[PDB]
Design a protein that fits this description.
This is part of a larger assembly, with chains A (101 residues), B (87 residues), C (116 residues) and D (70 residues). By secondary structure, chain A is of the alpha+beta class. Chain A is built from 2 helices and 5 strands, in the order E-H-E-E-H-E-E. In chain A, strands 2-3-1-4 form a 4-stranded antiparallel beta sheet, with helices on one face. Chain A is globular. The longest helix of chain B has 24 residues. Chain B has one domain. The chains are: A alpha+beta (101), B mainly alpha (87), C alpha/beta (116), D mainly alpha (70). Bound molecules: magnesium ion (MG) (76 copies). Chain B binds one RNA strand of 241 nucleotides through helix 1, helix 2 and helix 3. Chain A: InterPro entries: Ribosomal_bS6 (IPR000529), Ribosomal_bS6_CS (IPR020815), Ribosomal_bS6_sf (IPR035980), Ribosomal_S6_plastid/chlpt (IPR020814), Transl_elong_EF1B/ribsomal_bS6 (IPR014717).
Chain lengths: 101, 87, 116, 70
RNA sequence: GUGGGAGAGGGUGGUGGAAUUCCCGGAGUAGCGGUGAAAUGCGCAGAUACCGGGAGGAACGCCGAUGGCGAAGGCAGCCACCUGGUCCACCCGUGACGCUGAGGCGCGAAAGCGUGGGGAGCAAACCGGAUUAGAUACCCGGGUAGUCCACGCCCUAAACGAUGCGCGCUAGGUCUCUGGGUCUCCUGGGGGCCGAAGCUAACGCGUUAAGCGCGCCGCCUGGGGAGUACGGCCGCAAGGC
């Protein structure tokens, strides 16, 4: 199992009923693909540099996980199903290359 | 791919003595694993011809070492072959 | 018959013609002009002089609807691209801002043999 | 003129999510500035290009912009 | 072997924005387009230019390099999985296991062939408009194969460094990519430019040899006839050796 970072942008118009459900739906799909979580950063509303799905903003989620490698693409497919999910980018975790050190 | 966990299990299996990492038995063992890993990757992915060239080379390397063992100690060559199931 | 009084002026400059469209702040046009709309017919449309009279004709046309303020949008390389802007500044329409929005692809469609 | 590395702190060239520093590498348009203007090395520039393109897909950096002049 | 590295090396799936075309809506008149001039073309069934929505295909701006990877052909958005080659440090293991390589086998840009898809832009042939002494052309308006995908053929090339492969030896200077190092620099592995000795008909080559040697393969022996004829092998054909 390798370590990846999951980036998830969702529609920034959801109330608490909808935001909690879409997030616990993300929790459910991770359990189903064997992804142990390590840490999470929830950045929330963020001004987008270009309109995404006609909406000038996005709601941001970042996850650092350790999961089996063969199951990553099947995890992406399952995350992108939901309407309220707009971007899914799953990157292999890397070392923090420093500059101007 | 091939993790060092799997690597070490093969070397310790074919080492003529503990600490031996470069015996012709150890080399042909290691090669043979890489060969199978590749030919399974080539069973699907038949259109990957560049990776295939790498396989043609490992096959040649394995045969040169076997051809060498055959000449020097033909007994250890028979035991190596029957253990890996080749030829 | 609209009384918009503020809006956008798109200058479309190509080597063969310059043409000017003047819209309301949400983009729907109001009036327009070109080197062909003024008298010119042939290659004289892609002259800077035609670009001048084109901008000016669309300018006076937008005065009728009561325009004062203008946000200039420029697309294309062409003679009288600058000459048409300079006409718009002097036209009386106060020029709010000027932006070059010429569309360049990220190398997607094969160009006609003329452009390779 | 100054170069971007010259006026900056110690930053992660691989973090695609840090916009405040990544924005300082684009131009007036969304274009990725050349090494002449970023002061970066050969290898550093290769990493920046890839991280900026990542941020562009997350919606944080612009693909292209409009020039306000001329 | 161990521990590290850089990379458009390959295969598969997924995905992002810009742009072209087309459709829908809004707003809006008299032209647009194109050239040295024009004309054919398109436009009052409302085009061009402008804002919004949608569809579809193809290619990846900047980064981008005089850069990198690959044996060659060749390889540029981003992500993930599968995978090849290669370099460095340690001096650990095997103990000449090496080099080349007729035949064989595989790979092999573009164009072209077959079957089934796909089809936005471009565009042989073709249909026009111009130019012209003529125009079977260069320029302009259209446009089919094709270009794209799958699977199977085809095997050519200025397939070029017009320079076969490997090893040893023979001043340096300078720019560079990528490692390691006691990090003005030293030390490897690539990519360039000057240039010692030397070679070369000359241009030029010169530690990336076209120098000095060695091993092995391929190939040449005046031009035209001719890459033709014949025979053979291959190919569905075109045709190839
Ligand atoms: Mg979705
Ligand atoms: Mg004209
Ligand atoms: Mg282009
Ligand atoms: Mg093309
Ligand atoms: Mg193109
Ligand atoms: Mg050109
Ligand atoms: Mg154009
Ligand atoms: Mg151009
Ligand atoms: Mg040009
Ligand atoms: Mg070109
Ligand atoms: Mg050009
Ligand atoms: Mg060791
Ligand atoms: Mg690649
Ligand atoms: Mg690939
Ligand atoms: Mg790919
Ligand atoms: Mg319409
Ligand atoms: Mg007419
Ligand atoms: Mg037309
Ligand atoms: Mg037409
Ligand atoms: Mg008509
Ligand atoms: Mg008509
Ligand atoms: Mg539109
Ligand atoms: Mg379509
Ligand atoms: Mg471009
Ligand atoms: Mg360009
Ligand atoms: Mg470039
Ligand atoms: Mg380029
Ligand atoms: Mg190159
Ligand atoms: Mg190379
Ligand atoms: Mg080439
Ligand atoms: Mg690898
Ligand atoms: Mg030793
Ligand atoms: Mg010994
Ligand atoms: Mg002996
Ligand atoms: Mg051969
Ligand atoms: Mg064979
Ligand atoms: Mg071919
Ligand atoms: Mg082809
Ligand atoms: Mg075909
Ligand atoms: Mg065309
Ligand atoms: Mg044509
Ligand atoms: Mg004549
Ligand atoms: Mg092509
Ligand atoms: Mg070539
Ligand atoms: Mg010759
Ligand atoms: Mg030749
Ligand atoms: Mg050598
Ligand atoms: Mg160093
Ligand atoms: Mg060197
Ligand atoms: Mg010099
Ligand atoms: Mg000189
Ligand atoms: Mg000099
Ligand atoms: Mg000399
Ligand atoms: Mg001489
Ligand atoms: Mg000389
Ligand atoms: Mg020289
Ligand atoms: Mg030496
Ligand atoms: Mg030599
Ligand atoms: Mg011959
Ligand atoms: Mg003769
Ligand atoms: Mg003759
Ligand atoms: Mg001749
Ligand atoms: Mg002759
Ligand atoms: Mg002749
Ligand atoms: Mg001849
Ligand atoms: Mg001849
Ligand atoms: Mg002849
Ligand atoms: Mg002869
Ligand atoms: Mg021939
Ligand atoms: Mg005969
Ligand atoms: Mg024959
Ligand atoms: Mg036959
Ligand atoms: Mg025929
Ligand atoms: Mg024929
Ligand atoms: Mg022929
Ligand atoms: Mg023939």
């Amino acid at each position: 199992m390798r370590r990846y970072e999951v980036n998830i942008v969702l529609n920034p118009n959801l109330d608490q009923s909808q935001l909690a459900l879409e997030k616990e739906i993300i929790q459910r799909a991770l359990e189903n693909y064997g992804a142990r979580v390590e840490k999470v950063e929830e950045l929330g509303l963020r001004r987008l540099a270009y309109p995404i799905a006609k909406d000038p903003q996005g709601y941001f989620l970042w996850y650092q996980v350790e999961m089996p490698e063969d199951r990553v693409n099947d995890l992406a497919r399952e995350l992108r199903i939901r309407d309220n999910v707009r971007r899914v980018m799953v990157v292999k975790s890397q070392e923090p290359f420093l500059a101007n050190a | 791919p091939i993790t060092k966990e799997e690597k070490q299990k093969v070397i310790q299996e074919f080492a003529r003595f503990p600490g031996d990492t470069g015996s012709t038995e150890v080399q042909v063992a290691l090669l043979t694993l890489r060969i199978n890993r590749l030919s399974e990757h080539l069973k699907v992915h038949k259109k990957d011809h560049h990776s295939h060239r790498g396989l043609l080379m490992m096959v040649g390397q394995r045969r040169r070492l076997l051809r060498y063992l055959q000449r020097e100690d033909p007994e250890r060559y028979r035991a190596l072959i029957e253990k890996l199931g080749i030829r | 018959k609209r009384q918009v009084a503020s809006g956008r002026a798109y200058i479309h400059a190509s080597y063969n013609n310059t043409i000017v469209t003047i819209t309301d702040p949400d983009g729907n046009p109001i009036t327009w002009s070109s080197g062909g709309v003024i008298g010119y017919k042939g290659s004289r449309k892609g002259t800077p002089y035609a670009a001048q009279l084109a901008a000016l004709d669309a300018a006076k046309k937008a005065m009728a609807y009561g325009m004062q303020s203008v946000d200039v949008i420029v697309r294309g390389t062409g003679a009288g691209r600058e000459q048409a802007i300079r006409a718009l500044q002097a036209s009386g329409l106060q020029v709010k801002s000027i932006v070059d929005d010429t569309p360049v692809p990220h190398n997607g469609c094969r160009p006609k043999k003329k452009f390779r | 003129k100054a170069k971007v590395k010259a006026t900056l702190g110690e930053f992660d060239l691989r973090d695609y999510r840090n916009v405040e520093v990544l924005k300082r590498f684009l131009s007036e348009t969304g274009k990725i500035l050349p090494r002449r203007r970023t002061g970066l090395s050969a290898k550093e520039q290769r990493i920046l290009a890839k991280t900026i393109k990542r941020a562009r897909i997350l919606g944080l950096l612009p693909f292209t912009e409009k020039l306000v002049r001329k």
